[PDB]
């Protein structure tokens, strides 16, 4: 047993990290077949921020300008276009170590692993969730840009995140691998706030189903509640509303522990009402929204 936040093994991705430099800016980049992806924001300096035009700044750039390091070695740039917030840079070589893979846009609620790099080499890997307010809680220092997010499904790597910037709140913002940002954010330096966030109610519920399956059981109660009665409370405490699709998903978890979802919700309703009078649920003293029902399945049984 046991239950820890777990990140996919970073191996297959490690071999896709490269370093990119353009003037007084160095950030990481991702190298798939003969392509290298990274945040367009590389090609700016720190007066360009305020108000950069990217189409403009890019039309005065040569492949001469782009220094690509894969370890000691270096790669020539050939083509180079732009996808929303990302440069697609053609290079003289397809990556020996390019794996099977796709580009999916994850949805708020789903989770992914993050491989955090500096200067085109990785230094750390951690699991986190794609927040409902569209940002994420990462550990990211300057030079972190280019670092990617991702899942694994059998053998194929589902790519879903590339890190671009940190916000005034200390949270981070970035984009899928098509260049389209997650959330209402843009490459400029402007007045920009993380809109107030909420809690991933689907998740906390997957998380309680862990506790139970692991053997912890004190939070439950004889009651039930309608769905509509549950939400009324869930709103007050700043949680997402639970919908029927949610309730479907929890299907197999109620089927494994034999606990009706709407019962679980009664328990959660009760948990919100009362707190824990100080006590542990599966280690924590707070309610843990960063586990998918799906991750409680991979990891429990």
């Amino acid at each position: 047993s046991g239950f820890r936040k777990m990140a996919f093994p970073s191996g297959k991705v490690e071999g896709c990290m490269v370093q990119v430099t353009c003037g007084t800016t160095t950030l990481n980049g991702l190298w798939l077949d003969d392509t290298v992806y990274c945040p367009r924001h590389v090609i700016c300096t720190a007066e360009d921020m305020l108000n950069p035009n990217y189409e403009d700044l890019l039309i005065r750039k040569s492949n001469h300008s782009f220094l690509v390091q894969a370890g000691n070695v270096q790669l020539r740039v050939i083509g180079h276009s732009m996808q929303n917030c990302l440069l697609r840079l053609k290079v003289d070589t397809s990556n020996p170590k390019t794996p099977k893979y796709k580009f999916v846009r994850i949805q708020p609620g789903q989770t992914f692993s993050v491989l955090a790099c500096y200067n085109g080499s990785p230094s750390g890997v951690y699991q986190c969730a794609m927040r409902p307010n569209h940002t994420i809680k990462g550990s990211f220092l300057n030079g972190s840009c280019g670092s990617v997010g991702f899942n694994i499904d059998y053998d194929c790597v589902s790519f879903c995140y590339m890190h671009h910037m940190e916000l005034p709140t200390g949270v981070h913002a970035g984009t899928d691998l098509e260049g389209k940002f997650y959330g209402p954010f843009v490459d400029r330096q402007t007045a920009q706030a993380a809109g107030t966030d909420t809690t991933i109610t689907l998740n906390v519920l997957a998380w309680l189903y862990a506790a139970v399956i692991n053997g912890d059981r004190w939070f439950l109660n004889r009651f039930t509640t309608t769905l509509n009665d549950f939400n009324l409370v869930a709103m007050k405490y700043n949680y997402e509303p639970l919908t029927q699709d949610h309730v479907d998903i929890l299907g197999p978890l109620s089927a494994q522990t034999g606990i009706a979802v709407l019962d679980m919700c009664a328990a959660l309703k009760e948990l919100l009402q009362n707190g824990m009078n100080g006590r542990t649920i599966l280690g924590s003293t707070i309610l843990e929204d960063e586990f998918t029902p799906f991750d409680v399945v991979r990891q429990c049984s």
Partner: peptide
């Protein structure tokens, strides 16, 4: 305000 990283 912000931090392009």
């Amino acid at each position: 305000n912000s931090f392009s990283q």
